A and B are shown apart, each in its own frame.
Chain A
Amino acid sequence: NPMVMMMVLPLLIFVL
Chain B
Amino acid sequence: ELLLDSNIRLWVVLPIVIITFFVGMIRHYVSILLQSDKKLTQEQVSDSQVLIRSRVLRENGKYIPKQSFLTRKYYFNNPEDGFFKKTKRDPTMLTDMMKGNVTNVLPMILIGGWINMTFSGFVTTKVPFPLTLRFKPMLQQGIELLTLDASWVSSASWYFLNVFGLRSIYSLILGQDNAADQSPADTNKAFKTEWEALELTDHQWALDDVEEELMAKDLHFEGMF
Contacts and interface: CB of A to CB of B under 8 A. Distances in A.
B101 A7 contact: no
B113 interface: yes
Contacts, number: 22
Q: Is the interface of A mostly helix, strand, loop or mixed?
A: helix
Nearest to A15: B101
Contact of A8 (B101, B106, B141, B156): B106
Contact of B141 (A3, A4, A11): A3
A6 B56 CA distance: 48
B116 interface: yes
Nearest to A2: B113
What is the size category of the interface that chain B forms with chain A?
A: 10 to 19
Given A1-B117, A3-B116, A3-B156, A11 B101 contact: no
Nearest to A7: B109
Contacts of B116: 1, 3
A10 to B, nearest CB: 10
Nearest to A6: B138
Interface residues of A, number: 7
A11 B117 contact: no
Contact of A7 (B102, B112, B117): B112
B105 A11 contact: yes
Contacts of A8: 106, 109
B154 to A, nearest CB: 11
B110 interface: yes
Nearest to A4: B113
Closest 7 CB pairs of A and B: A4-B113, A1-B113, A7-B109, A11-B105, A8-B109, A3-B113, A3-B116
Interface of B: 101-102, 105-106, 109-110, 112-113, 116-117, 141, 156
22 contacts: A1-B113, A1-B116, A1-B117, A3-B112, A3-B113, A3-B116, A3-B141, A3-B156, A4-B109, A4-B110, A4-B112, A4-B113, A7-B109, A7-B112, A7-B113, A8-B106, A8-B109, A11-B105, A11-B106, A11-B109, A15-B101, A15-B102
